[PDB]
Symmetry: C4
Subunit: 262 residues, 4 copies
Amino acid sequence: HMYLRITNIVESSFFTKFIIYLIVLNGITMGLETSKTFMQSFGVYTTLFNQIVITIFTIEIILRIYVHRISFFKDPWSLFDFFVVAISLVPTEILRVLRVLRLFRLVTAVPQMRKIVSALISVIPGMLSVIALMTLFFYIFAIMATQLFGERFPEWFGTLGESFYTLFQVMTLESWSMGIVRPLMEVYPYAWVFFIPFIFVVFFVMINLYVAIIVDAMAILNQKEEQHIIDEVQSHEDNINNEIIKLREEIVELKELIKTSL
Amino acid sequence: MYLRITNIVESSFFTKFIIYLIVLNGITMGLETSKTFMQSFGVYTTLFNQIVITIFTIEIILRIYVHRISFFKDPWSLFDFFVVAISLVPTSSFEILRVLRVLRLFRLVTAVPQMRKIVSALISVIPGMLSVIALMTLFFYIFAIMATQLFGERFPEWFGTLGESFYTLFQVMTLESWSMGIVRPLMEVYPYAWVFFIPFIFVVFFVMINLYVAIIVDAMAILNQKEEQHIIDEVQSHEDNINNEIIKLREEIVELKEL
Amino acid sequence: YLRITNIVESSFFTKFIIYLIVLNGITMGLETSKTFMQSFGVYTTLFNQIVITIFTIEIILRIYVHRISFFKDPWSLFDFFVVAISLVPTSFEILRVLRVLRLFRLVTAVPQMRKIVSALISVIPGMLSVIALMTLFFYIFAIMATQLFGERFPEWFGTLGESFYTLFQVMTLESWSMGIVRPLMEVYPYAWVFFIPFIFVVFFVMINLYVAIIVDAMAILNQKEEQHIIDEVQSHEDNINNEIIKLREEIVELKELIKTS
Amino acid sequence: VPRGSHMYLRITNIVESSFFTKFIIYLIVLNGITMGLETSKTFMQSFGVYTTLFNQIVITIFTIEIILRIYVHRISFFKDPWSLFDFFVVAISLVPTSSGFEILRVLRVLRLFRLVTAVPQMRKIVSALISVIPGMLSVIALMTLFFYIFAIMATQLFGERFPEWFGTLGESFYTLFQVMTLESWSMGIVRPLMEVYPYAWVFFIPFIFVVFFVMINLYVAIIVDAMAILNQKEEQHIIDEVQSHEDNINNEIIKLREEIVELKELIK
Ligand SMILES: [Cl-]
């Protein structure tokens, strides 16, 4: 009974609008917390405000949980809001930084933003195949790079994780020649045979992956269209063919009678 | 009387003539670069500039009298208006005005409809993206704060300031020296700085790419709809035509049946 | 005259010329080696002087066969210009290098390759509009950059032509920040207000330019498809409409007859 | 030479069993982790001997497998690319460790791509990607020719004063690829070059434009040309229905137009 009373609140525009306002204010506050000048003067006023908004957010998420019960925790966006507000409550090192992640609540609380993100994410599940294939490709070349170049170049390829970092850098193309491969070729003149293929393969996959998405997305669109049009030509065909038997049966009716009279 | 000026203002001669001054004053702007040239042919120019700015003001004036309020409802006129004003404000103000005066070379886009169409075609995509543009700006702003309070003390040149983390994060997005120049340094002090900048790179590029994939595909969905509605509209017309005909021919037997 | 045409137009003639192109290509790549030229240099230079004659024999014949039609043809003109460059005496060496451009005759002489290039080039004329807009944009910002930064940074913006070069570099994004802008911000802390917009506009246009190509090319395909689909529905629309008349007139001519009887 | 004997059937039941394929895939994953631990100097000092045996084991089983698979599938094995790779890879692994080249010991980690061959999901992903290559070979060739031509020009123009970057044909090739990747093309190469040769930009700016034009436009075509094929496959389907529907009504009317002439014959 009272559940309905508060439910009208939690889901009211006032409730959501008010929260979105605090998110935006606390977002300005956290940018003002950057300034060493600012915190010296108005520091305390902020920290309490920080400690207030987090309280309200804890009130909010509690209500939202009581109103939505388990379906709250089946919701990605609620889960995020939940984690982000929890991390914020852990007592004041690195979490202190991650506390700026509650400004992403502005995405959660605004459906306009939810739609953008959901739209973007939609591609990822199909890609997991390729992502895995790529990670394997990296993992293999990371091992080769370490076994080939980690002896004479330990900072770049001394460790599996370091070859991984360096191979990602090569993929981004940042200083891959002047910075990395030209050095390596002073010692190992054929190092280009390892890193030019790595570039080609990696970039081929990236580009072609998205070519496929665009083309395959197009092919699905042409089918949704083809089925609509053909289904129409198929209804028009079922309509005349229904209206010809009425015309045909009359040459049977107007024959049977007109037959007897002759 | 009024028609005389308007018929003149909008003649091909008028616009072609203004376009002609735009181009000359444009070469002047490029010859004004050379110290050598200015030493010899310098003063000649300043008059030429001061001349064309007079003609342009006449032009802008006439155009306003002819179009009245319609002038200031037009973006391309306002730009021509704003720009030509810049040229008339006294040089020794605010030295930046002396520079922004070359923006009137963009008036070559205003006066040529070919160009006006190119730009308009290009702008057409912007309003759809503002959501994403906003999402990106927020994303930067949040990571700028993290980068500042993570790296600003030991690396104040790059992250000491919110506005500097913004500049540096944009650089990382452009991929320019993001590793050799910045992250590899940072990892000397903070070995786990890659956990912050590799995700940042992935997210940023994923959005940028997929945004344009969406444009291409969603632009296509509309094309397949506009087409689908043309084809189906024909099948629907082809039907009701036959329907009326069968109806008549079915009503025609009723006549013969009665008789 | 017909004898010459049968030769010039034969596969043997074109195939034989293509054979010299590929051969002349290997020697021209072997000319790179100081080792090679020391030993087999003279032998090569004779081959060079040989093939260039044969190509001139070829270019001559081809002109006699086609007359004006030859010089109205791009691919022939290329072979002509190219083979001429090779004939002008080596003496200002720059010509001696452009002589390697006759290896592009391998594209001229191979039709598959001629199709690839033509397919690629086919896009450009539409872009002439945008290229101009871009070139203007560069020219405008090149002027601004020169008179903003050339005083304190002559290497990068001291000259109009130099700001052009440096602004193209920014577009390629190579060292734009560490290399150029961060230095400039030492003197001009608001220099990012000039170079971040320049980056956005440039990349926005390039990307959107190709989005338009893909979608507008897409839209033409949807229209070429419509007419084809509509043209059949309308072929279906007219045949039926007649058969109703073959039925209509047959109903009338019968209904009228039944009336009499 | 089994052919179709009772024991050929014995091998076939093994090679094609779920256990056999699943077991091989399981070894691939373990030997894959093993090679990542072989990276660690600490680990090799302690558990080194354990590894080399396991490596020496998995290579044995994989050789057994490759053999069985050949007996079961005979020539179809060598007409299959994925089998050939499995074969090529495992042979590398069998070449003696300290051979003259001494690099195969590294190429031996390529057997981890075997995780792609044994997984049908992966085979399809790779096949989907490769499917584009043959169409491009024309363009790829056009590009290689372009590089080769510009590589020669770069050597003759800049190799004397700049032997590090263009002294050798193979070096101008490597530097021109770098320019294409846009890595330090200006600050690193062309700005230096212009200290000596101020018009060197006329050589490298076109090269950039042409190179990027082709690369981009190639993929534009793929998207569009692949598209027109989709529009053809579609319209035909629509035509074919609109074209059968035209065959149905046409007979329907004539089957009807003859029935009324059938009624006119009566009176006649
Ligand atoms: Cl019909």
